[PDB]
Amino acid sequence: DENKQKALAAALGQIEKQFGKGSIMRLGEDRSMDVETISTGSLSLDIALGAGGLPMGRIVEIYGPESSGKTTLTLQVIAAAQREGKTCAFIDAEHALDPIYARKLGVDIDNLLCSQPDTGEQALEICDALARSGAVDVIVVDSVAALTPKAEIEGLAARMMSQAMRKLAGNLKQSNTLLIFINQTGGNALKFYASVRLDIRRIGAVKEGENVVGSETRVKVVKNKIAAPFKQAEFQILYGEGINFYGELVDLGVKEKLIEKAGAWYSYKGEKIGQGKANATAWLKDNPETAKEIEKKVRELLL
C-alpha cells in the first residue's frame, strides 16, 4: 500500500497526461470531465452519461433496432439544444422525419436546417462544411446505414467513413459542434472516433388497461470517454408524448429520498402527491416549480 498507491496515481497521471483525462478511469469514479453538454431529454440517461448530457464538440453514435426509441431520443436532444438557442442541422438519408411528432417533442421544425444528400460522400462533406462554419451547434445524421457510396448508387462504406472521420472529428472539436450518427454501419472508424456510443432497445410495452400506450426503453452507454462507461438508463417513451421524464423524476426522487413512498402513496415534504407512480407523476407535471426543485436536487446529488 502507500508506495503502490503513489505509484499507481503517478502512472495514471502519466497516462492521462499523454493520452488525455478520459484515457483510463476507475469504473466507480464519481468524477466527470468538465464538458459542455446538451440534455438527452432523459433524466436517467443524463445521469448514466456522467456529465449530465451529451458532450459538445464530439461524435456520438446511437444505435439500435428500428422502433427502439432512437428517433425520439434524437428529436429530444434537438428540442433540448433548440430550447437553449442552439442551431441544429438534420442530415437525412432515411426520408422519414415526422414533423408532427417532432413538434410534439418541442422541435422547432421551422428553424431546423435539413439536407437530403445525393450520396454518402456528399452527406459527410455537408457535415464537415457545417462543422467548419462555427455557426452550427448540433448535427444529427440519420442514418449511417443509409449513407450509400456514390459508386454503389451507380467495405466501400467503411473506407468512406474512415476517410472523412479524422477531418470531421478535428473540425467538430474546434467549432464545439456535437455530431450524432444514428445507426442500426461504417466500420471501426465510427467505433473508435465516437466519444459516447449508446445502445438503445425497447424492452417492453407500457399499457393503460390492455392498451399499449408506450415502450419501456433501456439505453446502455457502451463507450464513454467523458465519464465512466457501462451505465444504463431505463425510461418510458409514451406514444405521441416522448420520454416520460416525470416518471423518471418520481423514481429517482424516491431513490434519493426526496419523495417518500409508503407502499402505494407518494409524498413530498409531508403531503401526499399521489397514489401510484402515475398519480405521483401527474402531480409533478401539474406542479412544475416543485418538480424543477426536486430535479435540481437529483442532479446535484447524482452528477
From Swiss-Prot:
Q: Quote the record's activity regulation.
A: The rate of DNA-strand exchange is stimulated by RadA.
Q: What would you give as a GO molecular function for this chain, any one? A: ATP-dependent activity, acting on DNA
Q: Which UniProt keywords apply?
A: ATP-binding, Cytoplasm, DNA damage, DNA recombination, DNA repair, DNA-binding, Nucleotide-binding, SOS response, Stress response
Q: Which Gene3D superfamilies match?
A: P-loop containing nucleotide triphosphate hydrolases
**Keyword DNA-binding attributed:** yes
* Function (record text): Required for homologous recombination and the bypass of mutagenic DNA lesions by the SOS response. Catalyzes ATP-driven homologous pairing and strand exchange of DNA molecules necessary for DNA recombinational repair. Catalyzes the hydrolysis of ATP in the presence of single-stranded DNA, the ATP-dependent uptake of single-stranded DNA by duplex DNA, and the ATP-dependent hybridization of homologous single-stranded DNAs. Mutations in this gene were selected in directed evolution experiments for resistance to intense ionizing radiation (3000 Gy).
Q: What is this protein called?
A: Protein RecA
Gene name, Swiss-Prot/TrEMBL:
recA
